[PDB]
Enzyme design. Sequence first.
Site, PDB file in Angstrom:
ATOM      1  CG  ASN A  37      38.716  25.360  49.872  1.00  0.00           C
ATOM      2  OD1 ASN A  37      37.935  25.414  48.917  1.00  0.00           O
ATOM      3  ND2 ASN A  37      39.667  24.441  49.967  1.00  0.00           N
ATOM      4  CG  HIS A  38      35.777  29.165  46.238  1.00  0.00           C
ATOM      5  ND1 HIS A  38      35.331  28.667  45.034  1.00  0.00           N
ATOM      6  CD2 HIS A  38      37.114  29.350  46.101  1.00  0.00           C
ATOM      7  CE1 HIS A  38      36.353  28.557  44.203  1.00  0.00           C
ATOM      8  NE2 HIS A  38      37.446  28.965  44.825  1.00  0.00           N
ATOM      9  CB  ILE A  39      35.979  23.960  46.574  1.00  0.00           C
ATOM     10  CG1 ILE A  39      36.314  24.455  45.169  1.00  0.00           C
ATOM     11  CG2 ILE A  39      35.554  22.486  46.527  1.00  0.00           C
ATOM     12  CD1 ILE A  39      37.270  25.622  45.155  1.00  0.00           C
TER      13      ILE A  39
ATOM     14  CB  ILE B 168      32.219  27.742  51.397  1.00  0.00           C
ATOM     15  CG1 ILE B 168      33.349  28.260  52.280  1.00  0.00           C
ATOM     16  CG2 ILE B 168      30.928  28.432  51.803  1.00  0.00           C
ATOM     17  CD1 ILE B 168      33.577  29.752  52.177  1.00  0.00           C
ATOM     18  CB  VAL B 169      30.036  25.306  47.184  1.00  0.00           C
ATOM     19  CG1 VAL B 169      28.840  24.772  46.396  1.00  0.00           C
ATOM     20  CG2 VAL B 169      30.343  26.729  46.774  1.00  0.00           C
TER      21      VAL B 169
END
Lengths: 164, 162, 174, 163, 163, 164, 164, 164, 174, 163, 164, 164
Positions: free
Chosen positions: K66-68, K70-71
Amino acid sequence: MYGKLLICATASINVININHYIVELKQHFDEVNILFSPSSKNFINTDVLKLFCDNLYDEIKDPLLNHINIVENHEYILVLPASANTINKIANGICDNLLTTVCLTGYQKLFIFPNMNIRMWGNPFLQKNIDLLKNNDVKVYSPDMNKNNITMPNIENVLNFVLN
Amino acid sequence: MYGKLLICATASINVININHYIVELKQHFDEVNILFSPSSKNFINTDVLKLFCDNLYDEIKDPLLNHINIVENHEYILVLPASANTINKIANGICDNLLTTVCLTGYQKLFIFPNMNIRMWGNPFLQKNIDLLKNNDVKVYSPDMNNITMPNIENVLNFVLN
Amino acid sequence: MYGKLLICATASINVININHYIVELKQHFDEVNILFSPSSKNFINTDVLKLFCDNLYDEIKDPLLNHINIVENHEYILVLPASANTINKIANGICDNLLTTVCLTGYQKLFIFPNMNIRMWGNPFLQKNIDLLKNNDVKVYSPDMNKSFEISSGRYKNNITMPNIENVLNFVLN
Amino acid sequence: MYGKLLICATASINVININHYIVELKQHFDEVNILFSPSSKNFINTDVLKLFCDNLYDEIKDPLLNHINIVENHEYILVLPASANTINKIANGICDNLLTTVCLTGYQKLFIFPNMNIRMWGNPFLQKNIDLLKNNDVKVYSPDMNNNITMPNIENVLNFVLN
Amino acid sequence: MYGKLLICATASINVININHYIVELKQHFDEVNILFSPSSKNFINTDVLKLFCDNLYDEIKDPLLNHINIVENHEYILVLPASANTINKIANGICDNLLTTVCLTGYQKLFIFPNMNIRMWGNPFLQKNIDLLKNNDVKVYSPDMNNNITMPNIENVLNFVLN
Amino acid sequence: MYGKLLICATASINVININHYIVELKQHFDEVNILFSPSSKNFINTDVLKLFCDNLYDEIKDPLLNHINIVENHEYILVLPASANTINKIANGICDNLLTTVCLTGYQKLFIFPNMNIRMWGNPFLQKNIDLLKNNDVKVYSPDMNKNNITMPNIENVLNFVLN
Amino acid sequence: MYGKLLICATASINVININHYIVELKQHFDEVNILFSPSSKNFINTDVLKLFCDNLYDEIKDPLLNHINIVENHEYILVLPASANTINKIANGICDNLLTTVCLTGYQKLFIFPNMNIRMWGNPFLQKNIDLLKNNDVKVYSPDMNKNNITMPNIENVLNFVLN
Amino acid sequence: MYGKLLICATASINVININHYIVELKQHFDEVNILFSPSSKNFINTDVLKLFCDNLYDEIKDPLLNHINIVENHEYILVLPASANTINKIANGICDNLLTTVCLTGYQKLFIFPNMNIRMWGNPFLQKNIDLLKNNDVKVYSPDMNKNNITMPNIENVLNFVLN
Amino acid sequence: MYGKLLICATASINVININHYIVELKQHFDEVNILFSPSSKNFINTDVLKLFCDNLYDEIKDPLLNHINIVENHEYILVLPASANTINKIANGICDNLLTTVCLTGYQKLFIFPNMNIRMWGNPFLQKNIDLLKNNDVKVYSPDMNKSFEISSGRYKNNITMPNIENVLNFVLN
Amino acid sequence: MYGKLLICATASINVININHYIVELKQHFDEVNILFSPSSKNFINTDVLKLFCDNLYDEIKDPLLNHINIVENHEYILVLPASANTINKIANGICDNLLTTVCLTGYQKLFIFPNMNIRMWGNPFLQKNIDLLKNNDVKVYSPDMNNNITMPNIENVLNFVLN
Amino acid sequence: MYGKLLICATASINVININHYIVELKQHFDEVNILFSPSSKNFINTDVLKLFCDNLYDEIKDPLLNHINIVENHEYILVLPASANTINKIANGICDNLLTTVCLTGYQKLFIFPNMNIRMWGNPFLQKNIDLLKNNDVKVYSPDMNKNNITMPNIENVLNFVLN
Amino acid sequence: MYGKLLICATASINVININHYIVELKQHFDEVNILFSPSSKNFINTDVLKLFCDNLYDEIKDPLLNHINIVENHEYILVLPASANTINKIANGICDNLLTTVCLTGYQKLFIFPNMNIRMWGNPFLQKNIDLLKNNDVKVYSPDMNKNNITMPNIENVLNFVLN
Ligand SMILES: Cc1cc2nc3c(=O)[nH]c(=O)nc-3n(C[C@H](O)[C@H](O)[C@H](O)COP(=O)(O)O)c2cc1C
Ligand SMILES: Cc1cc2nc3c(=O)[nH]c(=O)nc-3n(C[C@H](O)[C@H](O)[C@H](O)COP(=O)(O)O)c2cc1C
C-alpha cells in the site's frame, strides 16, 4: 441419429479402451464428446481422443469451462467406465472436479456403467449409494459378471440401457 | 506372529509418531507395511518409514499400484491415526486416493483408530458415519482421553485381535 | 459490533464479488477474516482480499494452520458463497481442505449461503444433504430468487441470486 | 523454570523422535527453541516442530539469521542428537551452516549428546576430538549404552545440563 | 578372489579414468562397487560406472543409504583417487557426505591413494593429517612420482591392499 | 606497481564493502582479482565486482576452473574478509570449494584478515588454528579493535601487512 | 606438427576414453579440437574436455556455430569413436546435428574410426554404407578384431591412418 | 511357448491399440516385452503397458540401457506398428534412438509390420527401402489393401508370420 | 490464382528472409501457408510469419497435426529454402519431423529449392540423392549462382544464391 | 570507410529486415554493431545478427554492460527502425532498458529513423516530442511516404548520417 | 530526533554502498526504511539491507503493497542514488513500479540526489525535467563534482539539504 | 446498440469490479471487448473476463497482436479504470505495452476515466498531463468526488460521457 452424447470417463483400468466405444457410438449419435476425471489421465493420453471425439472437454486447458452449457448441449450423459469412487461421489452430491460437477447438474440425463473388481463391487457403502441413485432416477446399469468376475458392458447392451 | 498387517496413516498430528507403532507391531505380525494419505506427507518424510517397515506403498512413485493385491496381501488393515476426513470418506465409500481405495476394498479387515481434537469428535455428521461404519462390520475404536490421545500399544493389540 | 466473523468462500462465480461483502460486514463485526477453497483461487487473486480483510488464512502459504484455533477465534462462520460441492461435503463430514475442515470443527457457528445455477439447486442428493444439515443445527439460508432472462432458452427463468447485506446480517444475528 | 534452551538437532536417525524431548523439556525451561542441520531435513519435516517449539530457526527461510543474537537469547544450547560429523566440526571450529556457527559462538553454553552406531563411536579421530572438546569446557555426555549406544533418558539430560 | 571391494572416488582429475581400475580389479575381488563424492560428479557421468561395477551407491537417488551396512558389506575400502580435501576431512573425522561418512565408519578397512598436483602435496596441514592417519592404522599409499605425482599402478595398488 | 593480487572473500557481513578495497588496492598491484565462498552470494551480487576487478573467478559459472593456474597467476593471495569458518578450514586443510582449494595450494602466498564478532573471536578451537596457521608461515593479521569489538582493516594497514 | 585436427566424437562407449587420444594427439598436431554428438553427452561431461583440447565446439551453448569455418579451420577431421549411426548418416548425407553437418561439409578431410559391438558390425546396411563411403574418397579405418571382438584404434594406428 | 518376444512400437496411430496385441501374444511367448519410439509417447501413456508387458524398456528413465543385451534376450523382435519413418531408418542403418538401435543390432530376428495411410505407402523411396530390407533377410510383412488403403495386420496374421 | 501453396522452410541461413517470398507469393496463390523444421526455429521467431501467412503449422503447439490433410489441402508444396539435410532425408524417405513427414506423403506435389554453401553442394552423397529425387518425379531446381566478393578473404568465389520470385514461379507453374 | 556505427533497433515490424541494412552499412563503417529493445525479441531471434554484426550487445546475457563505453566506441548511433514508443521515451529522457540508456547518453551522435503505421504518426504527443527532439540536437529523419510510410533506402540513410 | 525517513534506491552503481547511509542516517531519524527499483536488484542483494534498516519494502515479495500508507508513514522520502531514468519518470508522472508510484504520491516530501556519469548529466531532456521538478516543490540536489565527474553526497550534505 | 467498444483496464484497485461494467455495457454496445495492462493481472484472473466479454486481447498468449486492427475494430475505447501511470504515459506518447500502444494509435476514440487515491490526484505532473490530453481531443472524464475521496463512474455517467 439420436442427438449429442457425452462420455464421462473415470480412472478405471478399462478407460484405456474407451476409444473403441467412441467410434462405435459415433454411428448412432449426432455427436459423441468426452470428459475425463483427473485420475484417468494417469492411464492414457487423453489428447488422442481428440482424433475420435467431436469435442474433448479439458478442465486443465480451460479451468473456467461452463458445466451448465455442457449439460444443456447433450441429451445423454454416460459415465463409462464408472469407478466406485465417482459413483459414490455422485450419490452424495460431491462435485470436486468438472466431470463430477457435470454429473450433479445433469442427473436427469445420467447413465452409469459400473466397472471395478468384483471385491470392490461388494462394498456395503457402494451398494447403499447405488440403491440411492436408482431410487432417484439415475440409471445405473447392472455389471456384466462373467468369469465370478465382472466385464465391461457390450456396445449393444449400452444402447439398450440408454435408448430402451 | 499373526500375519501381514497394513497401516493406513492419515493427516493427523500424531502421524509424526507412527514409527513407534511400527517397531512395536513388528514383534507380533509377520510383516507390518504402511501406506500414507497425500496430506500426511506434509507432516513427515514418509521415506524414513522404509527403515522400519517391511514395505512402503507410495502412489506417487507408482501411480498404478494394485490395491486389490495390497488387500489380499494383508490379514489386518489399520487406519492409524484415523482422521475425521478419512473416516467420513470411508463411511460414504469415497475412494479418491490409494489409501482410501484400499479401505473400500478391504472393509472386512478394517480397524479404525480415530484421532482428532475433542471438538471435531463431537461433529454430528462424523458420529452418524461412525455408527454407519460399526453397523456394517467395520471395527471402530473409541478415542482415549483434556483431549483425545493416541491408542496404547496394549489396546491396539487387544482391539485388533479381539 | 458483534465479534469476529470468518467468511469461508468457495468456487462459486460470485466469489469475484466477495470484496463487497467484506467492507460492508467490517462495519458490524469486530473483525472479518477470510478463508478460500483451493478451487476458488481460479476465479480471483485471493491476496487482494488482504486489503479489505483483517486476516487471510492461506493453507498454501502455511500448510500447518491450526483449524481449531481458527474456529475458537470466531463467533460466526459463514460459507459465502457456498457451492453445491462444499455444502454436500460438509453434510457428509468430508474435510479434505482447510475451509472444509474448519466447517466440520465449527458446525455450531456455521451459516451457509447457497449459490449456484437453478438446475444444480434441484439435485436430489444436494437437497437431501441440505435437509440433513438443517435437522442438525446448521443454519442454511434459503437462496434468494429473482426473475431473469435466460438467453439459452430465450425465456425468463427464476434465477438464484446472492444474499442481501441486510439479509445476511439478519439471518446471522437473528 | 531455568531459562531459554536451544536444541541443535543433527542428521542422526533419532532426530525423528526429537519432538518427544521438546514437550518434555518445555516443562523445565522458559522456552525451548530448535535449529536443525541441513541434512537432518532428510529425516523429518522440520516445520512440524513449530507445533511444539516456541521458535524454529530456519536458515533457508531466512539466510541472514543473527547467530550472535541466537546465542545471547539462550542460557543452554544442546546438540541433541549429536552426530559424529557435527561433533568433529565443532571440535575443529568448522562452522559451515547455521547450527554449527551457533555452536562455535556459544561454546561456553554448549552441551553435546552423541548418538551414532557403536562402530562409528570407536573412530580414533572422533575420540581425539571428544577429548579436545572436554579439555576445553565443552560438556560432552557419555553415550548411554547397553553393545549399542542409545538416546539420552530425559531425566539424564536434565541432570547433565542443570547439575 | 579376495572378497568385496569398495572404491570411494573423489573430485580428482583422474577420476575420469576410474573405469579402468574397475574392470581390472573385477578380476581379483568377488565384487567391486563404487561410491562418489558430490564434487566428482562434475567430472564424469557416474551412472556410466553402473556398466562396469557390481553396484553404485548414489546418495542423491537414495538419501537414506545405510553406511553401516555398506561398510560391513566390504572387506576393503579404497579412496581412489583421493583428494587433499577428503584426506584432510577423514583425518579430522569430518563426514558431511556419504563417501566421507563411510570412510569414518570403516577406518579399519581403509586404503588411501593420494592424487593431486605436487604443490598441493607440499601443504603442511595436509602432511600433518597424513601422519595422523598413518599413526592411527589408516593405510596411506605414498604417491608415485617422477617432478610430479602420477596415479597408482594396477600392480602396485594390489600389493598395498593385499599385503 | 607490484604483481597480481587475488582477493578471496568469505561470508562476513563486511564482504558487502569489499568493493572499496578493490579500487584502492587497484592502484598498487598490476591486477586485483577476486573469488568468493559460495555463502558470500547471500550477502552481495558477486557479478558487480566484475566492474572493478580485472577478473572474477566464479565456480558456478565454470566448475572446472584450474586452481593451480590461479595460484601461479598471483604473487599475493588475500583472504579478506576472513570468516572463522574459512580460517578453521584452511588450518585443517579442508578445501571443499574453490576459494578454500586456492588457499590450500597457495599457503606460501596467503595473507589472512579475520573479521567476525568479538565473541566468535574468543573460540579456543579457532585460536588453536590461528596459531597453527602462523607457526606454519601463513600470515594472519591481528584484528583491529575499537571500544571492545573487531573492525575491518584500513587499506593502509593491509598494504603494510602485505608488502612489508 | 601437421596442422589443426578436429575430433568428432559420437555416442560409443569408448567416448569415455577420448581424453587419452587428445593429450596424445596434441603432440603431433598444432591444435586438436573436439565436437560431440548430442547423444555422447549421456556418457561423459563434455566440458571436461576443455581442459585437454584447444577448443570445444558446443552447439547447445552456441546454436549458430559456423560449420563452414569449422571445416576450413582444420586439415584433418576424425570421427573417433565412430558409431554405426553416424557412419550411416554420413553415408546418406544426413546432417541433423552439428557434428554430422560438419562431416558432410568436410567429406574430403574425413577419417572414420568405427567402434561398435561385433554383431552391429555385421549389419548389411551398415556395410553397404561403408563401401559407399570408401568408393567416394572417405577414409574408413578397418577396426581391431581382438579379444569375435572389437576394439579402439591404438594411438599409433589412428596416427598412422591419418598422416598416411 | 516359443520364447521371449520384443515389440518395438512406433508413432503410428494404431499404437494406441498395442495393448491388445500384448495380452494376446502373452499366450504364445514366454515373455512379451515392449520398447517405444520417442514420438509414440505423444499418442499414449507408455507406463500403462507395464500392466500388460513383462518388461518395458524406457530410454528416458535409463539412458544407458544395453541394446546388445536386449537383442540377445529375445528370439523375436517385431516392429509393430511400423511407421514409414522407422522402416526407412532401419533400411539405411540409421539408429538415432534406442528402438532403432535395437533394430540395427538384431536385423536377423526382425519382423516388420508396416502401418500407414495408403498414400504414404506409395512413396518410391519407402518402397525402394522395403525391397532393400527384404533382399537382406529382414522379414517385412506385406500389408493388405482394402477399403482403398492399408489395414493393420491381424493378431492371427502376426502370429502366422512370426511363427512361420 | 492457382490454389493453395505450402512452404516447408528448413534451417538454411536464408530462412530469415522467407517473409519476403510469402507476401510475394500471396499474389499468385489462393493461400500460402508455412511449416518449419525444428532447427529453423533457432534462426527466426516463427510466430511472426502468422502475420504474413494464411496458416502456420506448428507441431510443438499441436503434436497431433494431420499431415495427410495438410498434403490434400495443398496443390503445391515447396521446400524453400531447402537444406542439404532435409534434401537427403527426403531422398531416403526419412520423416522424423512434421515437415519431413509432409514431404514424404506429398512427393508428387513437391518442389525443392536447394540453398547451402557451395562446398556442401559438392558432396557426393547429396548429389547422388538429388539424382535419385529427380529420377523419381520430385522437382529439384538448379541452384542459382553468381560471382560474389568475400571478406573471408580478398578473393572472388562462385556462390549459390536464393531464387528470384520469378524463378520459383516458373519452376513451379510449368 | 568511416568510424564505428551502432544500430539501436526497436520493436517495429521492420526489425525483421534489419539484417539487410547491416551488410550494406558494413561496407562503409569500420564496424557496424547492434543493440535491441526487449520487445524486439518477439519479432526475430536476435542472436542470428551476430552472424552479420561485428558486436551484439545483449542486456540479458550481461545485465551489467557499461553504456558509457558503448557510446564512446561509436561515432554514429542510429535508432533504426525507430518505434513511436522509443522515440517518445528518448524525448522525455526515459531510459529503462539498455537501448534507451545508450540513447540518453549519446544524444549528440544520435540519428532516428521512424517506422510505424501512418495513423500512429499523426499522434499529437509523438509529433510534439519529435519537435522537442529536433530542437535539442537529435537528428530525426523524415519518413518516406507513398498515403503510407516505408523504410529508409540505403543511400538515404547514408546521406542523413554522413552529410 | 526527526521523524521516519524512506530511501528509494535506484539502479545507480553507487547503490552498492547505500548501506553506509542507512547506519549514519539512523542516528538522526526515528526510522530509516528502504525500497528499491526492480533494476536495482542487478547490483546488490537487497535482502542484506534488512540488517540495517527498520523495514524494507519488497514489491516482488509482496506485489500488493500500500503505497498511500507508505508515503503516509514517512516525513521524508529520499531517492538515493537517483538515476536519470527515475528522475525523468517522476518529472513526467510515470509510475510503473512501486518506487516510482511512491514518488508520485509523496512529491511533497521528495528529496532527489542525482547520481550518474557526467555525460548523461548533460542531457537536455534530463535537465529540463529537473527544472520542471524544482518548480513543483520537489527538491533536487545539485551533484557535487571533483577530480571531472559527479560523486555521491556525504552525510553532512544530505543531512543539510534534507533538514533545512 | 452503438457499435463495438473496447475497455482498456489498468492496475487500479477497482479493476476487481470491472466485470460489473462489462455486463452492463453489453446492453448498449454491439460488442464489449477488453484489454488489460500487465500490472492489472496482479489484481485479478483476467481469463475470467472471457465469460462476460465478447473478446479478450491477451498480449502474453499472443505477443504479435495487431494493435492497428484492434483500433479499427472499435468505435469507442475506454481506459477504465485509468491509473495515474497510464494517463501520464498516454499523455507523453509512451506505449511500452499493448494497452498503451492501442491508446496511442486510437487517441481520437479515447475516453479516460481516472481512478486513484485523492492524494495521487493532486500531483502537479499528472494534472499538467491531464490538461495536455484535454487540449488535444482526448476525453478525460472528471473523477466523481464523494467523501473527500474519488469514486468509480456510475454506469449511467460513463454512458453519457461516451455517447454525447
Ligand atoms: C538413515 C541414516 C541414519 C544415520 N544415523 C546416524 C546417527 O545415528 N549418528 C550419526 O552420527 N550419523 C548418522 N548418519 C550419518 C549422518 O547423517 C551424516 O554423517 C551427515 O553428513 C551428518 O550431517 P550433520 O552433522 O549436518 O547432521 C545417518 C545417515 C542416514 C542416511
Ligand atoms: C493494491 C494496490 C492498489 C492500487 N490502486 C491504484 C489506483 O486506484 N489508481 C492508480 O492510479 N494506481 C494504483 N496503484 C498503483 C498502480 O498499480 C501502479 O502505479 C502501476 O504501476 C500502474 O500500472 P498500469 O498503468 O500498467 O496499470 C495501486 C497499487 C496496488 C498494489
